[PDB]
């Protein structure tokens, strides 16, 4: 069960190349890359061009995933035309997780992890269904605590243990 | 039928004052202002403070609207902790619309206006249920065409005329 791009999936990739009219983006190692058009951004034109570079993390939406063709991703909201959280992810940390964990985090409102984290710290989170969680707090120590917490929660997949895992991981943090 | 803040409403306001720990924000003229805490932003703390000023337009979410108290708005996503399109609205144009028009635009996927506009130009749109639409295109002429189109569509409220209104308003624009 390696990740297969399907349409409308939110994913986190890394820019692995810049080409004439698109980025090559990796959603997982040892897998085929996906394509991010330079036009796939808010109000994008040949004048209004993106400025991402190799090694940048990007949050995106799978827009096409045809059989036997390179899948394509986009970094804007189809309805509003706005970034809506898609685009570059800066100054945060990535946790690699199993695909079910990511799916739970994105779609299950009863999944208690975000609520557990929120009791300890303010954070920003982006959830890639390709098995990557991105997290960022104001303070590095808080970001790190979220990183370790999310990683340990994923490995244990015991939702009742999440609260205790976070409590331990945030032990030396005022909040 | 003037706008009454209710919880979870997306609204567009203008910063009318800056205070010690919040902005005073107007959602409509001749109405009571609402309150935007300096903490009501992504990863906000007393160090990580917002930089909005009087006259700035803001997209926000009504978070509290108690009876006989000043309503409160926020500029982040409660789940993700990210801006999610909330915050400052720059370099676009505002159309004042009736509250039903805004409600239709935000909630009705069959309402054909956005699709009608999209056939003519790429745009960014934000919809305030307080009766304000914000639109922005790369080119000023396109932004203006969207502005006039949205305004005329609202006054006529004849969804079948939308296509023709846009066609006329975008007459001198290559797209």
Curated annotation (Swiss-Prot), chains A, B:
Signal peptide, first to last residue: none
Role, per record: Non-catalytic component of the RNA exosome complex which has 3'->5' exoribonuclease activity and participates in a multitude of cellular RNA processing and degradation events. In the nucleus, the RNA exosome complex is involved in proper maturation of stable RNA species such as rRNA, snRNA and snoRNA, in the elimination of RNA processing by-products and non-coding 'pervasive' transcripts, such as antisense RNA species and cryptic unstable transcripts (CUTs), and of mRNAs with processing defects, thereby limiting or excluding their export to the cytoplasm.
Additional observations: Present with 6050 molecules/cell in log phase SD medium.
Location of the S1 motif domain: 6-76
Keyword Electron transport: no
Included stretch of the parent chain: 62 to 236 of 240
Keywords of this entry: Cytoplasm, Exosome, Nucleus, RNA-binding, rRNA processing
Subunit structure and binding partners: Component of the RNA exosome complex. Specifically part of the catalytically inactive RNA exosome core complex (Exo-9) which may associate with the catalytic subunits RRP6 and DIS3 in cytoplasmic- and nuclear-specific RNA exosome complex forms. Exo-9 is formed by a hexameric base ring of RNase PH domain-containing subunits and a cap ring consisting of CSL4, RRP4 and RRP40.
Protein name, as recorded: Exosome complex component RRP40
GO BP terms, alphabetized: CUT catabolic process; exonucleolytic trimming to generate mature 3'-end of 5.8S rRNA from tricistronic rRNA transcript (SSU-rRNA, 5.8S rRNA, LSU-rRNA); nuclear polyadenylation-dependent rRNA catabolic process; nuclear-transcribed mRNA catabolic process; poly(A)-dependent snoRNA 3'-end processing; RNA catabolic process; RNA processing; TRAMP-dependent tRNA surveillance pathway
Entry annotated with the keyword RNA-binding: yes
Annotated organism of origin: Saccharomyces cerevisiae (strain ATCC 204508 / S288c) (Baker's yeast)
Record localization: Cytoplasm; Nucleus, Nucleolus
Cellular component, GO annotation: cytoplasmic exosome (RNase complex); exosome (RNase complex); nuclear exosome (RNase complex); nucleolus; nucleus
Gene Ontology MF terms: manganese ion binding; RNA binding
Family indicated by similarity: Belongs to the RRP40 family.
Lineage of origin: Eukaryota, Fungi, Dikarya, Ascomycota, Saccharomycotina
């Amino acid at each position: 069960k390696r990740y297969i791009p399907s349409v409308n999936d939110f994913v986190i990739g890394v820019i692995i190349g810049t080409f004439s009219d698109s980025y090559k983006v990796s959603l997982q190692n040892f897998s085929s890359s996906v394509s991010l058009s330079y036009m796939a951004f808010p109000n994008a034109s040949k004048k209004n061009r993106p400025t991402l570079q190799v090694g940048d993390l990007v949050y995106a939406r799978v827009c096409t995933a045809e059989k036997e063709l390179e899948a394509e991703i986009e970094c804007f909201d189809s309805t509003t035309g706005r970034d809506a959280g898609f685009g570059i992810l800066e100054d945060g940390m990535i946790i690699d997780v199993n695909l079910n964990f990511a799916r739970q985090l994105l779609f299950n409102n009863d999944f208690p992890l975000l609520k557990v984290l929120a009791a300890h710290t303010k954070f920003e989170v982006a959830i890639g269904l390709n098995g990557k969680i991105w997290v960022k707090c104001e303070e590095l120590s808080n970001t790190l605590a979220c990183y370790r917490t999310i990683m340990e929660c994923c490995q244990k997949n015991d939702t009742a243990a999440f609260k205790d895992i976070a409590k331990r991981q945030f032990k030396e943090i005022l909040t």
